[PDB]
Design a protein. Structure first.
Length: 236
Protein backbone atom coordinates (compact mmCIF):
# COMPACT_ATOMS: atom_id res chain seq x y z
CA UNK A 1 0.00 0.00 0.00
CA UNK A 2 2.96 2.33 0.57
CA UNK A 3 4.05 4.66 -2.22
CA UNK A 4 6.76 7.31 -2.52
CA UNK A 5 5.98 10.96 -1.89
CA UNK A 6 7.20 11.89 -5.39
CA UNK A 7 4.69 9.63 -7.16
CA UNK A 8 1.82 12.00 -6.25
CA UNK A 9 1.20 15.30 -7.99
CA UNK A 10 -1.37 17.46 -6.12
CA UNK A 11 -3.17 19.44 -8.78
CA UNK A 12 -6.43 21.16 -7.70
CA UNK A 13 -7.67 21.77 -4.16
CA UNK A 14 -11.15 20.30 -3.55
CA UNK A 15 -11.66 20.99 0.17
CA UNK A 16 -10.50 21.46 3.76
CA UNK A 17 -6.60 18.30 6.63
CA UNK A 18 -7.36 18.87 2.91
CA UNK A 19 -8.76 17.06 -0.17
CA UNK A 20 -7.03 17.40 -3.60
CA UNK A 21 -7.37 16.10 -7.10
CA UNK A 22 -4.03 14.79 -8.29
CA UNK A 23 -1.98 12.37 -10.30
CA UNK A 24 -0.49 9.03 -9.27
CA UNK A 25 2.59 7.75 -11.14
CA UNK A 26 1.99 10.31 -13.96
CA UNK A 27 -0.84 8.08 -15.27
CA UNK A 28 -3.71 7.92 -12.82
CA UNK A 29 -6.19 10.57 -11.64
CA UNK A 30 -6.73 10.17 -7.91
CA UNK A 31 -8.15 11.93 -4.92
CA UNK A 32 -5.74 12.90 -2.15
CA UNK A 33 -6.48 13.61 1.55
CA UNK A 34 -3.71 15.35 3.59
CA UNK A 35 -2.46 15.55 7.27
CA UNK A 36 -7.01 0.18 8.24
CA UNK A 37 -10.69 -0.25 7.34
CA UNK A 38 -10.38 0.74 3.69
CA UNK A 39 -7.63 -1.89 3.25
CA UNK A 40 -10.00 -4.72 4.30
CA UNK A 41 -13.26 -3.57 2.66
CA UNK A 42 -13.37 -3.92 -1.14
CA UNK A 43 -16.47 -3.42 -3.30
CA UNK A 44 -17.57 -1.74 -6.57
CA UNK A 45 -19.83 0.71 -4.74
CA UNK A 46 -17.32 1.64 -1.95
CA UNK A 47 -14.70 4.29 -2.74
CA UNK A 48 -11.46 2.36 -3.27
CA UNK A 49 -8.22 3.05 -1.36
CA UNK A 50 -5.26 3.07 -3.73
CA UNK A 51 -2.29 3.97 -1.61
CA UNK A 52 -0.96 5.52 1.57
CA UNK A 53 1.95 7.70 2.71
CA UNK A 54 1.91 6.53 6.34
CA UNK A 55 4.39 8.83 8.16
CA UNK A 56 3.44 12.46 9.06
CA UNK A 57 2.63 14.46 6.93
CA UNK A 58 0.36 11.60 5.96
CA UNK A 59 -1.43 11.10 2.60
CA UNK A 60 -4.38 8.88 1.74
CA UNK A 61 -5.01 8.14 -1.92
CA UNK A 62 -8.28 6.88 -3.43
CA UNK A 63 -10.09 6.61 -6.76
CA UNK A 64 -11.22 10.00 -7.99
CA UNK A 65 -14.97 10.50 -8.23
CA UNK A 66 -15.42 13.09 -10.94
CA UNK A 67 -18.78 14.55 -9.71
CA UNK A 68 -17.99 15.17 -5.99
CA UNK A 69 -20.72 14.42 -3.46
CA UNK A 70 -24.21 13.34 -4.37
CA UNK A 71 -25.50 16.38 -2.47
CA UNK A 72 -23.49 18.69 -4.83
CA UNK A 73 -24.60 16.63 -7.82
CA UNK A 74 -28.31 16.68 -7.03
CA UNK A 75 -28.17 20.49 -6.31
CA UNK A 76 -26.17 21.34 -9.50
CA UNK A 77 -27.10 21.63 -13.17
CA UNK A 78 -27.89 17.92 -13.38
CA UNK A 79 -30.67 17.94 -10.83
CA UNK A 80 -33.22 19.31 -13.25
CA UNK A 81 -32.59 16.38 -15.58
CA UNK A 82 -32.64 13.52 -13.12
CA UNK A 83 -35.87 11.55 -13.00
CA UNK A 84 -37.05 8.70 -10.83
CA UNK A 85 -35.30 5.95 -12.87
CA UNK A 86 -31.96 7.74 -12.47
CA UNK A 87 -32.61 8.43 -8.72
CA UNK A 88 -33.85 4.86 -8.04
CA UNK A 89 -30.83 3.37 -9.82
CA UNK A 90 -28.48 5.53 -7.64
CA UNK A 91 -30.41 4.54 -4.47
CA UNK A 92 -29.93 0.88 -5.56
CA UNK A 93 -26.10 1.27 -5.95
CA UNK A 94 -25.90 2.87 -2.50
CA UNK A 95 -28.01 0.04 -1.00
CA UNK A 96 -25.62 -2.30 -2.76
CA UNK A 97 -22.54 -0.74 -1.13
CA UNK A 98 -24.45 -0.77 2.15
CA UNK A 99 -25.41 -4.47 1.59
CA UNK A 100 -21.71 -5.16 1.57
CA UNK A 101 -21.07 -3.12 4.76
CA UNK A 102 -23.98 -5.05 6.32
CA UNK A 103 -22.46 -8.41 5.31
CA UNK A 104 -19.06 -7.41 6.74
CA UNK A 105 -20.71 -6.59 10.10
CA UNK A 106 -19.64 -2.94 9.81
CA UNK A 107 -21.68 0.19 10.67
CA UNK A 108 -21.42 3.47 8.70
CA UNK A 109 -23.00 5.92 11.21
CA UNK A 110 -23.18 8.94 8.90
CA UNK A 111 -25.00 7.76 5.75
CA UNK A 112 -26.52 10.69 3.81
CA UNK A 113 -26.09 12.34 0.39
CA UNK A 114 -23.04 14.43 1.40
CA UNK A 115 -21.12 11.22 2.08
CA UNK A 116 -21.94 9.53 -1.23
CA UNK A 117 -19.62 10.29 -4.11
CA UNK A 118 -20.67 10.25 -7.75
CA UNK A 119 -18.66 9.45 -10.86
CA UNK A 120 -19.29 9.23 -14.61
CA UNK A 121 -22.46 7.51 -15.90
CA UNK A 122 -24.07 8.04 -12.49
CA UNK A 123 -21.83 5.57 -10.56
CA UNK A 124 -22.44 6.34 -6.87
CA UNK A 125 -20.20 5.10 -4.09
CA UNK A 126 -20.19 5.06 -0.28
CA UNK A 127 -17.29 7.12 1.14
CA UNK A 128 -26.67 15.09 11.81
CA UNK A 129 -29.82 14.55 13.89
CA UNK A 130 -31.95 14.89 10.73
CA UNK A 131 -30.35 11.70 9.34
CA UNK A 132 -29.87 9.78 12.58
CA UNK A 133 -32.14 7.11 13.96
CA UNK A 134 -33.88 8.03 17.27
CA UNK A 135 -32.17 5.19 19.15
CA UNK A 136 -28.75 6.24 17.82
CA UNK A 137 -29.26 9.94 18.68
CA UNK A 138 -30.82 9.17 22.07
CA UNK A 139 -29.03 6.10 23.29
CA UNK A 140 -25.90 5.73 21.20
CA UNK A 141 -27.38 2.61 19.66
CA UNK A 142 -25.68 2.72 16.28
CA UNK A 143 -26.26 -0.43 14.19
CA UNK A 144 -26.72 -1.48 10.62
CA UNK A 145 -30.41 -0.71 11.34
CA UNK A 146 -29.70 2.92 12.26
CA UNK A 147 -27.92 3.13 8.87
CA UNK A 148 -31.13 1.77 7.31
CA UNK A 149 -32.96 4.68 8.93
CA UNK A 150 -30.47 7.16 7.43
CA UNK A 151 -30.87 5.49 4.08
CA UNK A 152 -34.63 6.30 4.20
CA UNK A 153 -33.65 9.94 4.77
CA UNK A 154 -31.27 9.75 1.85
CA UNK A 155 -34.23 8.46 -0.27
CA UNK A 156 -35.90 11.82 0.48
CA UNK A 157 -32.77 13.70 -0.51
CA UNK A 158 -32.78 11.82 -3.80
CA UNK A 159 -36.46 12.43 -4.40
CA UNK A 160 -36.33 16.14 -3.57
CA UNK A 161 -33.08 16.46 -5.48
CA UNK A 162 -31.11 17.46 -2.42
CA UNK A 163 -33.42 19.46 -0.14
CA UNK A 164 -32.58 19.38 3.55
CA UNK A 165 -34.88 16.81 5.30
CA UNK A 166 -37.68 18.19 7.57
CA UNK A 167 -37.89 21.69 5.85
CA UNK A 168 -38.44 24.45 8.39
CA UNK A 169 -37.79 22.33 11.47
CA UNK A 170 -34.81 22.85 13.73
CA UNK A 171 -33.02 19.86 15.26
CA UNK A 172 -34.79 19.82 18.62
CA UNK A 173 -38.12 19.99 16.87
CA UNK A 174 -37.18 17.11 14.55
CA UNK A 175 -36.16 14.93 17.47
CA UNK A 176 -39.24 15.90 19.56
CA UNK A 177 -41.52 15.22 16.56
CA UNK A 178 -39.95 12.02 15.40
CA UNK A 179 -40.30 10.62 18.96
CA UNK A 180 -44.04 11.27 18.73
CA UNK A 181 -44.37 9.24 15.50
CA UNK A 182 -43.95 12.02 12.95
CA UNK A 183 -42.39 10.99 9.64
CA UNK A 184 -41.86 13.09 6.51
CA UNK A 185 -44.78 12.80 4.09
CA UNK A 186 -44.56 11.65 0.46
CA UNK A 187 -42.36 14.12 -1.55
CA UNK A 188 -44.21 15.78 -4.52
CA UNK A 189 -44.59 13.41 -7.55
CA UNK A 190 -42.87 10.66 -5.67
CA UNK A 191 -44.82 7.34 -5.90
CA UNK A 192 -46.46 6.17 -2.60
CA UNK A 193 -44.77 2.76 -2.93
CA UNK A 194 -41.43 4.55 -2.77
CA UNK A 195 -42.50 6.61 0.26
CA UNK A 196 -43.79 3.41 1.82
CA UNK A 197 -40.25 2.05 1.54
CA UNK A 198 -38.98 5.15 3.40
CA UNK A 199 -41.55 4.50 6.10
CA UNK A 200 -40.22 0.96 6.42
CA UNK A 201 -36.74 2.32 7.02
CA UNK A 202 -38.16 4.64 9.63
CA UNK A 203 -39.90 1.99 11.78
CA UNK A 204 -39.67 2.64 15.53
CA UNK A 205 -38.30 -0.89 16.19
CA UNK A 206 -34.80 -1.09 14.58
CA UNK A 207 -35.26 -4.89 14.11
CA UNK A 208 -38.36 -4.32 11.92
CA UNK A 209 -36.45 -2.20 9.39
CA UNK A 210 -35.43 -4.05 6.23
CA UNK A 211 -31.93 -5.20 5.40
CA UNK A 212 -29.91 -3.44 2.75
CA UNK A 213 -30.04 -6.75 0.78
CA UNK A 214 -33.81 -6.30 0.81
CA UNK A 215 -33.58 -2.56 -0.14
CA UNK A 216 -31.18 -3.21 -2.96
CA UNK A 217 -33.37 -6.03 -4.45
CA UNK A 218 -36.50 -3.91 -4.14
CA UNK A 219 -34.89 -0.91 -5.86
CA UNK A 220 -33.27 -2.93 -8.69
CA UNK A 221 -36.67 -4.44 -9.45
CA UNK A 222 -38.62 -1.21 -8.90
CA UNK A 223 -39.89 -0.52 -12.44
CA UNK A 224 -41.03 -4.11 -13.15
CA UNK A 225 -42.27 -5.25 -9.81
CA UNK A 226 -43.65 -2.15 -8.12
CA UNK A 227 -44.25 0.67 -10.68
CA UNK A 228 -44.58 -1.03 -14.03
CA UNK A 229 -46.77 1.84 -15.28
CA UNK A 230 -44.57 4.69 -14.12
CA UNK A 231 -44.49 7.75 -16.38
CA UNK A 232 -42.02 10.67 -16.05
CA UNK A 233 -43.63 13.86 -14.70
CA UNK A 234 -42.42 17.43 -14.59
CA UNK A 235 -39.73 16.81 -11.86
CA UNK A 236 -39.75 13.05 -11.08
Amino acid sequence: WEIPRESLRLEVKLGQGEVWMGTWNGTTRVAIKTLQVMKKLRHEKLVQLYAVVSEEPIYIVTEYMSKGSLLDFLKGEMGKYLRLPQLVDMAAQIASGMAYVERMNYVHRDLRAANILVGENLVCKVAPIKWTAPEAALYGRFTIKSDVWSFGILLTELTTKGRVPYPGMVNREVLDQVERGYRMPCPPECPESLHDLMCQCWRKDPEERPTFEYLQAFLEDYFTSTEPQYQPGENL
